[PDB]
Coordinates of C-alpha atoms and ligand atoms in Angstrom, one line a residue:
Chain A
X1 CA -79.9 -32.3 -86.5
X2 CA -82.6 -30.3 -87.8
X3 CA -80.8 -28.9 -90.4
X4 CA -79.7 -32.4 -91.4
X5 CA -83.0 -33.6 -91.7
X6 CA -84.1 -30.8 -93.5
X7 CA -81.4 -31.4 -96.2
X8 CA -82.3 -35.0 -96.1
X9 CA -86.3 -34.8 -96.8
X10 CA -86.0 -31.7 -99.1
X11 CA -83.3 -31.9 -101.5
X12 CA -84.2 -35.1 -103.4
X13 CA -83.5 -35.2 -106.6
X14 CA -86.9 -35.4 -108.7
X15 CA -87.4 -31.8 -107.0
X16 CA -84.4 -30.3 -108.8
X17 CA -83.8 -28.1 -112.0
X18 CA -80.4 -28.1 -113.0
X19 CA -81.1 -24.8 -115.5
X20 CA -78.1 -23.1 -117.9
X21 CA -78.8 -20.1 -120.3
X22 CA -76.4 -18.7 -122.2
X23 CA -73.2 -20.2 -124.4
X24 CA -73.8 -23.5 -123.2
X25 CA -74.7 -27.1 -125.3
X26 CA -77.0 -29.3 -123.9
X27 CA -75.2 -32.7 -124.7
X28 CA -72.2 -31.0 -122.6
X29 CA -74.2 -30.0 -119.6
X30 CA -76.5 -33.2 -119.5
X31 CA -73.1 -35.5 -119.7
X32 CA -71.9 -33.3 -116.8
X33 CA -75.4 -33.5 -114.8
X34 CA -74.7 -37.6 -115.4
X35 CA -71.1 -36.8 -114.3
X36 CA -71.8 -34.8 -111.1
X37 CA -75.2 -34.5 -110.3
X38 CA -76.0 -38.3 -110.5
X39 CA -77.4 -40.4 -107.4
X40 CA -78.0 -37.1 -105.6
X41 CA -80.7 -38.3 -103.3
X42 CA -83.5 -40.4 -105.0
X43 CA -84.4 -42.2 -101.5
X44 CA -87.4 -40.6 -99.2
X45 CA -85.4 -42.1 -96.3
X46 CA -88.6 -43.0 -95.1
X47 CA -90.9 -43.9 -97.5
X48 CA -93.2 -40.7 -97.6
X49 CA -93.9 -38.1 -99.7
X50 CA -93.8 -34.6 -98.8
X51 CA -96.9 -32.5 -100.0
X52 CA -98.5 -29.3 -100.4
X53 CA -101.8 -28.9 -98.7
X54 CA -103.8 -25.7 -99.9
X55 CA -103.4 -22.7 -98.1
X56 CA -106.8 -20.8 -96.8
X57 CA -107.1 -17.5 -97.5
X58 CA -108.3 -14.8 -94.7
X59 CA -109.7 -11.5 -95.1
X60 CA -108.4 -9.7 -92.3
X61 CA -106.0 -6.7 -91.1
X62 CA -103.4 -6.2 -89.8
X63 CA -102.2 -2.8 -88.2
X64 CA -99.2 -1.6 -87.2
X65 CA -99.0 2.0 -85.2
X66 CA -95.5 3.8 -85.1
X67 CA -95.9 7.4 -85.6
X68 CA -93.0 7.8 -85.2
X69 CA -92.4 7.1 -88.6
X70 CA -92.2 9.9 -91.4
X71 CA -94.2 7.5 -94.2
X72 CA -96.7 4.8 -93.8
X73 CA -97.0 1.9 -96.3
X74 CA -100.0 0.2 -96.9
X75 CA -100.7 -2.8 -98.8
X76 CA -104.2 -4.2 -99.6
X77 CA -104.7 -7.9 -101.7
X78 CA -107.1 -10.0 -102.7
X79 CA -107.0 -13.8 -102.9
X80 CA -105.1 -14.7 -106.9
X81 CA -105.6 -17.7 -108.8
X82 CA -102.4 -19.4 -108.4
X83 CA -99.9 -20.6 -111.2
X84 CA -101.6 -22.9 -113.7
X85 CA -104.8 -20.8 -114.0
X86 CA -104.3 -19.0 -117.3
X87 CA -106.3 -15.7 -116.1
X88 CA -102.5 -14.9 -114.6
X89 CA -101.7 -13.6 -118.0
Chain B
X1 CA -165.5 7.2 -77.6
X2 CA -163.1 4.7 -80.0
X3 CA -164.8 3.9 -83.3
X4 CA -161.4 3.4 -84.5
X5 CA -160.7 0.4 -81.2
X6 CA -160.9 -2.7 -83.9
X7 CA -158.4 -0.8 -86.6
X8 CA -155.9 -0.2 -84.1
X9 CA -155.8 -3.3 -82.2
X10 CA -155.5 -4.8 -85.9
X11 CA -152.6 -2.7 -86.7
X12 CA -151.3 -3.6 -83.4
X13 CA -151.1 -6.7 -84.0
X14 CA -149.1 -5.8 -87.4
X15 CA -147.0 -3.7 -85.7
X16 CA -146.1 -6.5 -82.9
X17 CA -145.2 -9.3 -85.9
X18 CA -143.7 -6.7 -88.1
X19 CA -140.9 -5.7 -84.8
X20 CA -140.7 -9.5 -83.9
X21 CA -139.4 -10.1 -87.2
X22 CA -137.1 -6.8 -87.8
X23 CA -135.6 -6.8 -84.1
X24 CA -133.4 -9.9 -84.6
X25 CA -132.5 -9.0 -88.2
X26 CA -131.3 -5.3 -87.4
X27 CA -129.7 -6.7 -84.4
X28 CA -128.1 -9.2 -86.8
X29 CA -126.4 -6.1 -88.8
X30 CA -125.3 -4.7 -85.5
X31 CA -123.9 -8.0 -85.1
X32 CA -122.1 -8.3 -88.3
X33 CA -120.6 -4.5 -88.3
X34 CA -119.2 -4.1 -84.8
X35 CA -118.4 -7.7 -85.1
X36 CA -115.8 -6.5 -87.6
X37 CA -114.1 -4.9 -84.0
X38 CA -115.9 -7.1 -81.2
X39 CA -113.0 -10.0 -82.4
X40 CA -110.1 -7.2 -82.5
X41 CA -107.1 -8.2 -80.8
X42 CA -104.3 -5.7 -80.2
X43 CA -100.7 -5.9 -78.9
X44 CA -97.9 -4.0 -77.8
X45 CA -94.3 -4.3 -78.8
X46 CA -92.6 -1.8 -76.9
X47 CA -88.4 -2.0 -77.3
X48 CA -87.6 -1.7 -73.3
Ligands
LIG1 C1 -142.9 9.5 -88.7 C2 -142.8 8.1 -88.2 C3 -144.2 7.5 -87.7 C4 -144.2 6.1 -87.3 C5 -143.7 5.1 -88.3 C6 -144.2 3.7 -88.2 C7 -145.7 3.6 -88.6 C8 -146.2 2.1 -88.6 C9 -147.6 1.9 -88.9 O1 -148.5 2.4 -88.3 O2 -147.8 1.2 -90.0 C10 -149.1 0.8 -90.4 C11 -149.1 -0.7 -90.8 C12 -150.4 -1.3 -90.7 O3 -151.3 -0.8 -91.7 P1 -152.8 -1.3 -91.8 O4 -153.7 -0.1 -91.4 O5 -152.9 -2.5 -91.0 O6 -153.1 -1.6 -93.3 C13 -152.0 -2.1 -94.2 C14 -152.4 -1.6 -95.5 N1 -153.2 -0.3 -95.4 O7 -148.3 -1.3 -89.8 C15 -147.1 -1.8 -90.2 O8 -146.7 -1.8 -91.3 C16 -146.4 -2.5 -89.0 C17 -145.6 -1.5 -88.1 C18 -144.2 -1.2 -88.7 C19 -143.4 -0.2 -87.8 C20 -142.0 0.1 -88.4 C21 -141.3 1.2 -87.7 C22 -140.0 1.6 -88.4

């Protein structure tokens, strides 16, 4: 039942790329997205939008001891600027 | 016997402001450093 409402509140269809690359023509592939891929969802089912609240970054550590390990892998980050923020590049 | 009485009490009283404002802000440092490991929390996962 979960899995059915997970299918039903996250694969609408204004959250979907249909993408092709390669030896394809676009007037093909968007009469076949009209064809196929038409009235895939386009209902909430209940009338409210999922969203993305921000996510809080936390300096911290975390440690994990296992000597019995030959090699230990260590990662250290810092909090990134996201998508849209053209420092990325 | 204490020509130097007024000085010292005067410095005294330096002394005593001077440490009743630098006790609470080195403790604060202590605070902040071992702070870092007074909030540890540690587990144990062992595979029985
Ligand atoms: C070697 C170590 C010896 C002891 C170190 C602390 C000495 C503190 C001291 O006596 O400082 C004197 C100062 C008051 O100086 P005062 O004579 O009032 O005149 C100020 C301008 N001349 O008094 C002060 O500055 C206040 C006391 C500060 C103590 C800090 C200790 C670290």
């Amino acid at each position: 039942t979960d899995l059915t409402d997970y299918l039903n509140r996250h694969y609408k269809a204004p959250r979907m790329v249909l993408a092709a690359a390669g030896g394809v023509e676009h007037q093909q592939l968007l009469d076949l997205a009209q064809k196929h891929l038409s009235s895939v969802s386009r209902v909430y089912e209940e009338d409210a939008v999922p969203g993305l609240t921000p996510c809080r970054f936390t300096g911290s550590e975390i440690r994990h001891r296992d000597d019995a390990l030959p090699l230990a892998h260590v990662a250290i980050a810092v909090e990134g600027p996201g998508w849209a923020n053209p420092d990325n590049v | 016997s204490e020509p130097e009485h007024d000085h010292r009490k005067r410095m005294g009283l330096k002394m005593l402001l001077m440490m009743g404002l630098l006790l609470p802000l080195t403790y604060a440092m202590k605070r902040h450093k071992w702070s870092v490991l007074k909030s540890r929390k540690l587990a144990y996962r062992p595979p029985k």
